[PDB]
Amino acid sequence: NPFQFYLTRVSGVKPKYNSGALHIKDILSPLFGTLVSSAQFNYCFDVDWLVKQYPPEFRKKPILLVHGDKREAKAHLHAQAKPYENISLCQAKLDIAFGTHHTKMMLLLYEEGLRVVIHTSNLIHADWHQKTQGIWLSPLYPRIADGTHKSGESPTHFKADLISYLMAYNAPSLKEWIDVIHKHDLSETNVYLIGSTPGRFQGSQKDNWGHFRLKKLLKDHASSMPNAESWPVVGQFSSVGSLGADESKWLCSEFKESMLTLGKESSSVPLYLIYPSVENVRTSLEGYPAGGSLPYSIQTAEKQNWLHSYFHKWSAETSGRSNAMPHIKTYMRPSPDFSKIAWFLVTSANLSKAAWGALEKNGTQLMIRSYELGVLFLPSAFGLDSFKVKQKFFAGPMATFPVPYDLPPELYGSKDRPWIWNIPYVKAPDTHGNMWVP
Numbered sequence: 001n002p003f004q005f006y007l008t009r010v011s012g013v014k015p016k017y018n019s020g021a022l023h024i025k026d027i028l029s030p031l032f033g034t035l036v037s038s039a040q041f042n043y044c045f046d047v048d049w050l051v052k053q054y055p056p057e058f059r060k061k062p063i064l065l066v067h068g069d070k071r072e073a074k075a076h077l078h079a080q081a082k083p084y085e086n087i088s089l090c091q092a093k094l095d096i097a098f099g100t101h102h103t104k105m106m107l108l109l110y111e112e113g114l115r116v117v118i119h120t121s122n123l124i125h126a127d128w129h130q131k132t133q134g135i136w137l138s139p140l141y142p143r144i145a146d147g148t149h150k151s152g153e154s155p156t157h158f159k160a161d162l163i164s165y166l167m168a169y170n171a172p173s174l175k176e177w178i179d180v181i182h183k184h185d186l187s188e189t190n191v192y193l194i195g196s197t198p199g200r201f202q203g204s205q206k207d208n209w210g211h212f213r214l215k216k217l218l219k220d221h222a223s224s225m226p227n228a229e230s231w232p233v234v235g236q237f238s239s240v241g242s243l244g245a246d247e248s249k250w251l252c253s254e255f256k257e258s259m260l261t262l263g264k265e266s267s268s269v270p271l272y273l274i275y276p277s278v279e280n281v282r283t284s285l286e287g288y289p290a291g292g293s294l295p296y297s298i299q300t301a302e303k304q305n306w307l308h309s310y311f312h313k314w315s316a317e318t319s320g321r322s323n324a325m326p327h328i329k330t331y332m333r334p335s336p337d338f339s340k341i342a343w344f345l346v347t348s349a350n351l352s353k354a355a356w357g358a359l360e361k362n363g364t365q366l367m368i369r370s371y372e373l374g375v376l377f378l379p380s381a382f383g384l385d386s387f388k389v390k391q392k393f394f395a396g397p398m399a400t401f402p403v404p405y406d407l408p409p410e411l412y413g414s415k416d417r418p419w420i421w422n423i424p425y426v427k428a429p430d431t432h433g434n435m436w437v438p
């Protein structure tokens with residue numbers, strides 16, 4: 001396959017559904033490269049667990065943890081890492097209120113080259129145990145010979161775009177990683193980087209981040225087709241922010257408008273949102289505790305009941321993962337019969353203004369609160385006009401894209417409700433015999 005899109009291993013499915021899945025121990029194994037140094041960008045860390053996922057022979061190599069924690073949370077993380085002399089920390093600045101450092105990325109420096117991993121899992125045992133999570137694995141990027149002058153750039157501009165994402169942190173430990181990237185040849189990269197960083201962006205900088213970045217890429221590198229109004233938009237996520245009092249405030253006015261962009265020329269496009277119902281969570285492998293990782297609060301949800309009419313159940317028979325609750329986030333543009341897709345994005349970004357950005361100042365400024373990162377698969381980057389959807393995720397032309405959940409998505413039934421993490425569920429017990437009492 002040219003796509004290098006993987007799911008994490010799930011404990012408890014049949015082996016056919018983990019063949020070709022990856023555990024973090026697989027990603028860090030010597031088979032992938034002889035580790036010299038690594039950076040772990042993430043939100044939540046269990047440092048004792050994390051160090052045990054590195055091969056024993058690599059556990060004293062330098063590790064940088066890039067995080068957004070402040071105050072006592074920051075102290076707790078520093079205390080976690082203090083027993084390991086080889087671990088350094090970088091606190092990502094979060095100068096806009098209510099922002100978070102959501103990006104999940106590994107930079108892996110080897111004796112043989114460099115690898116970039118952009119994924120959706122926190123660095124804790126539960127996120128790699130029984131959840132549906134996504135991974136993009138870069139090629140092994142070779143080092144550019146000293147004295148040779150070449151860009152090392154790909155047709156998707158991935159090298160410059162990753163460096164630009166890292167520059168936005170303004171962090172000395174990440175300048176070191178920028179210099180590493182400069183020294184390597186990333187020209188084989190076939191995906192586009194889509195990042196979010198905190199700030200208020202106007203003018204040309206508007207197109208650099210969030211949903212304006214997506215719009216720019218779809219305008220420049222995708223083509224509109226006849227009856228494009230009939231190609232749905234699908235969004236799939238583990239968390240929902242406050243979107244406003246109705247769909248015109250943000251969801252269908254600027255977010256959907258960016259998502260439905262195709263090509264450079266001048267809406268009834270169906271929008272499917274996939275988010276676990278209470279019943280999805282209750283009957284999951286984890287049971288109700290899976291809902292601790294689906295943080296939709298009742299305070300938010302009661303202000304936007306209009307949104308839930310867009311919601312579709314989690315279903316993933318194609319990958320044997322209907323009972324492995326999603327922490328992956330994906331967005332895509334399928335054809336009216338869901339047999340093709342015009343593009344596919346895997347990202348850390350949930351359905352929220354903080355992650356994707358919201359226009360301010362009479363439409364002239366895009367304000368983003370958080371750090372996010374994903375990669376975009378465009379057919380043009382593979383010499384194609386569209387991607388065929390793979391019918392079975394782990395089945396046997398390699399130019400069909402592995403969509404990890406079922407199409408078409410299934411609308412909530414009348415008795416279904418979106419999972420809301422901070423109210424009780426005491427009507428029916430979960431797969432472990434328990435209720436949910438927050």
Ligand SMILES: O=C(O)c1ccc(O)cc1C(=O)O
Pocket residue numbers: 043044100102122238239293294295348350
């Ligand atoms: O796992 C995360 O990085 C995360 C952190 C805080 C949230 O409120 C939501 C999420 C999520 O991605 O679901």
